Enzyme design. Sequence first.
Site, PDB file in Angstrom:
ATOM      1  CG  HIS A 261      56.549 -12.655  32.072  1.00 57.18           C
ATOM      2  ND1 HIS A 261      55.997 -12.110  30.991  1.00 57.18           N
ATOM      3  CD2 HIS A 261      55.993 -14.039  32.335  1.00 57.18           C
ATOM      4  CE1 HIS A 261      55.307 -12.974  30.509  1.00 57.18           C
ATOM      5  NE2 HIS A 261      54.892 -14.382  30.617  1.00 57.18           N
TER       6      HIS A 261
ATOM      7  CG  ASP B 195      62.295  -1.536  34.309  1.00 53.87           C
ATOM      8  OD1 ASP B 195      62.083  -0.772  34.883  1.00 53.87           O
ATOM      9  OD2 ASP B 195      62.016  -1.008  32.788  1.00 53.87           O
TER      10      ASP B 195
ATOM     11  CG  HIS C 179      57.868  -1.664  32.326  1.00 52.67           C
ATOM     12  ND1 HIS C 179      57.878  -2.144  31.326  1.00 52.67           N
ATOM     13  CD2 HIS C 179      58.328  -0.326  32.333  1.00 52.67           C
ATOM     14  CE1 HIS C 179      59.180  -1.576  31.082  1.00 52.67           C
ATOM     15  NE2 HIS C 179      58.963  -0.407  31.803  1.00 52.67           N
TER      16      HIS C 179
ATOM     17  CG  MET D   1      53.024  -8.365  31.639  1.00 51.88           C
ATOM     18  SD  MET D   1      53.907  -9.760  31.511  1.00 51.88           S
ATOM     19  CE  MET D   1      53.967 -10.044  32.938  1.00 51.88           C
TER      20      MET D   1
ATOM     21  CG  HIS E 135      38.541  16.590  32.402  1.00 46.44           C
ATOM     22  ND1 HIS E 135      39.429  18.258  32.306  1.00 46.44           N
ATOM     23  CD2 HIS E 135      36.977  16.806  32.081  1.00 46.44           C
ATOM     24  CE1 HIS E 135      37.538  18.843  32.740  1.00 46.44           C
ATOM     25  NE2 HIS E 135      36.966  17.576  32.898  1.00 46.44           N
TER      26      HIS E 135
ATOM     27  CD  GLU F 293      41.182  23.307  31.144  1.00 42.04           C
ATOM     28  OE1 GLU F 293      40.330  23.643  30.749  1.00 42.04           O
ATOM     29  OE2 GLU F 293      41.699  24.605  31.156  1.00 42.04           O
TER      30      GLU F 293
HETATM   31  O1  LIG Z   1      34.484  16.411  28.511  1.00 43.00           O
HETATM   32  N1  LIG Z   1      34.593  16.992  29.137  1.00 43.00           N
HETATM   33  O2  LIG Z   1      34.777  18.118  30.103  1.00 43.00           O
HETATM   34 CU   LIG Z   2      55.675 -10.252  30.064  1.00 49.12          CU
HETATM   35 CU   LIG Z   3      35.439  18.610  28.709  1.00 48.62          CU
HETATM   36 CU   LIG Z   4      60.277   2.096  31.600  1.00 49.91          CU
END
Ligand SMILES: O=N[O-]
Ligand SMILES: [Cu+2]
Ligand SMILES: [Cu+2]
Ligand SMILES: [Cu+2]
Lengths: 335, 335, 335
Positions: free
Chosen positions: A88, A91, A128, A143, A248, A272
Amino acid sequence: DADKLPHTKVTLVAPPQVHPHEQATKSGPKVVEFTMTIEEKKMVIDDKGTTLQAMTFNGSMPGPTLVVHEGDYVQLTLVNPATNAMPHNVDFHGATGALGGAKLTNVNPGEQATLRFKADRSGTFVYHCAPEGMVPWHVVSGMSGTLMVLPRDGLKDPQGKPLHYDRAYTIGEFDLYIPKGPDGKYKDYATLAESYGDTVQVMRTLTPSHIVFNGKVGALTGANALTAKVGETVLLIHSQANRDTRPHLIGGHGDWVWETGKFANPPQRDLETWFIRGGSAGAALYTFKQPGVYAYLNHNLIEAFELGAAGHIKVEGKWNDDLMKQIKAPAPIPR
Amino acid sequence: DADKLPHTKVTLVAPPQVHPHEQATKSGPKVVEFTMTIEEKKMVIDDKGTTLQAMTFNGSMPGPTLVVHEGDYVQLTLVNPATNAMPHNVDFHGATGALGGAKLTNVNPGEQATLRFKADRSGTFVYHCAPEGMVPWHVVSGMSGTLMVLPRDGLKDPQGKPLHYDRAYTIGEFDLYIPKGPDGKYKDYATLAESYGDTVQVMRTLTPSHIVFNGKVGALTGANALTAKVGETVLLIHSQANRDTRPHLIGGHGDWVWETGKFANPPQRDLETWFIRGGSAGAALYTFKQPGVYAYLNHNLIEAFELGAAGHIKVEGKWNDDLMKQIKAPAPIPR
Amino acid sequence: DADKLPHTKVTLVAPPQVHPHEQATKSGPKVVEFTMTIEEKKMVIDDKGTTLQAMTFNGSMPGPTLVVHEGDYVQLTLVNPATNAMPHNVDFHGATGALGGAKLTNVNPGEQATLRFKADRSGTFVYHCAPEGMVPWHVVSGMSGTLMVLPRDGLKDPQGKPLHYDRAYTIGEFDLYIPKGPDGKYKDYATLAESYGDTVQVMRTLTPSHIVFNGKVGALTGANALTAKVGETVLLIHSQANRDTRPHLIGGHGDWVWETGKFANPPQRDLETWFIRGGSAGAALYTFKQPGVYAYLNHNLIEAFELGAAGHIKVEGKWNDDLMKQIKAPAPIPR
Ligand SMILES: O=N[O-]
Ligand SMILES: [Cu+2]
Ligand SMILES: [Cu+2]
Ligand SMILES: [Cu+2]
Ligand SMILES: O=N[O-]
Ligand SMILES: [Cu+2]
Ligand SMILES: [Cu+2]
Ligand SMILES: [Cu+2]
């Protein structure tokens, strides 16, 4: 010169919490030191027992959120224990050079490395894993996480007025690509290595099997709901390292939102629903005004309710009939 | 009056370069004259030798970028040589009226047409073919590019400060829908018309077989990597005529970005990843601070590394350890 | 106190029109009363006779647009007739608390309920049905619409200058998930409940069978094209309750656009294509400068032309050769 700055150690905490930190600070630049240890592990990701041959920073999806202030230097020691089977690296979208640090942090199992970079830009940024030749697999397998680089004087509205939160929560949203066998059931693999080929086939369809917050369907629900109360201001940090999402808060709003996640830009208000581009982290502030169990979700409602991209916020306090009132409860249509 | 302004002819250059031009100019309005010749051709789009029955402006994917200044008039001669199979036309998102010019530029093979419009709005704007009833097909098969309308006094930051670049690069990203046969291999067609029915089936699934920069996997890599150096400022113009993308420069940032591509609006800074709405062109400024090979990609990493939406920038110069330093190289964990 | 404010009743009109309203008003806050009745009904959604077992507010896809001003209270009576099959409710993204109202408006067939909330935030906001355990199905079957909360002093540009429209139109865009039988033909169901299981399996694939404006392919074309004239300014309200879209006026622009749809934020100018996030409504102003038939569409062109996300605006007036001129009509290439 950075070598001569004071060095401080921060202990990281598991998501959805964020380690303690200051917003506006009188402190000057420091080299803030962190350690993360990679863990490959099979995880159960839904209510039916479907598993993911996962890969994580610090044992969680997402990885823990690292907070520093603009001008600080982040110094991370990344450990890849011998108990792991794959190489691994890391970054940091918040860093400059060497593919975010990935070129300087190639750790095979049994090794570690330490990287330093200057956090010269404020915002929420994804970090990541990114091993050359298999970046997507490692990322979709778990990751990634967020680096939040707060401005020294804290967060500001578009007119320069200060914005302050009482609590930060961190949500990472993960699009998962779990293979199925001929019987139409999800495959369960004895080893990480065995999951690879089949998983890449699924990824190439661009259709995730599950989309989860913090590692599983229901991670941020029930006993593990996020919590708040009326009058409290929360910062909701949302990362998606691979695919777009559209957060949301049902029954609420984004009072001030940095959807691209960069705090030197003015936020937008009254949203919203906002938008986190795959490969980024954004942040929203909200101050609760009504008690109740809220849902916080990806507002592609199929992705939320069918594939798993939904959690809850349980809010204490007193109901406000001026904001909303049930004038007439559900009853028979007048005859 | 437009007919009485000075006329001037610009010679277009092949992507990823952009033809020479001024940013801030002392010059007044001009009718700027451009010619483009439609070339239908079979192109090899990946390293296995898969082919696309392609359609191009000027023989390349994307078409060349046309650059003018706000207030200039664009005057394009669109030629459809006799050796092509299909009718074509052109729709400039930068233009006003007649479906962007498309109704006035319907050229059958063997014909040409000349269109003038006033470039009265600044920004990067997509142009693309749009023959009635065949629009998606001509666009996904390659017929799109960018018109950049620079403001007369050059690019501005949100506070009105000048922004200047040393080199503009133009990247076109193409979602391709290549059909497969019963054996699961990509089909190779002898004629453009032969590819039609099968391609339309694949399109209706909304799942691209490949997503490529500038016409093929690997187009902007190796000998054809983009290039820059430490201290240099590049403008990265990104077009996507049909589908969303989310550009990111690995190891770098978007210093100033107009993701919706429209320069009269203030740009945003410090972006890790930005977003080009399908059907649009956007532009990002970055000043390199570290040398090395960077990846410039669509940060749906599956889209980038599995389907093709990635390129490289080779950057010469001196490493800066203040910005990033390898404190400890990968080594075995002390036992 | 809301109980003592004046109360007035507004009569709703069918999309694409919006009910009569003022922009800037001298009136003070009011409780504005509206009624909507839920109609479940089988609807024909394309030109080959494909049907949707649809669910609607007031008989239409989208539900009608409710217009009030910031500081008003919205007071909706929601009627679920005895003859429907399913429970419904309403979640106003413009409201605060109780999942947008959903918890307070759970109406079984034969019942109604009355909800008041303070519209304290300006913008276009989605409302949609959200019955527990069936949210996606009810939204994608057609139960959404827009609340437009206009600032009391009307729309403002980024510098504070007023912006006024002569006519608002409301476009609701619906991603549909129509099942197919073994023969590859779209299923046609006798009842609503019969559609459920099959529809859920299509939804999980995340691939729509159709994407339509206002309930069907070509709903806003031909006799039903939207209308305007040169010099007229229109407001184009666009809602998508479940899935992202990228509207574009071909031959035009978004002169000023709030893509996140929240009017206290400064709009952006000169957009070729904007972005409505799944679960939101946005708004664009354009002043027509050329006559002719414009297409207004989702600029993923497969979604527009193959799946149905396209309509038309027919514009009367006088052609302007300075904006655009056919210098030379299509004719043989010179030799
Ligand atoms: O369920 N979207 O407000
Ligand atoms: Cu990795
Ligand atoms: Cu909604
Ligand atoms: Cu990236
Ligand atoms: O201008 N889009 O066809
Ligand atoms: Cu064409
Ligand atoms: Cu177009
Ligand atoms: Cu319903």
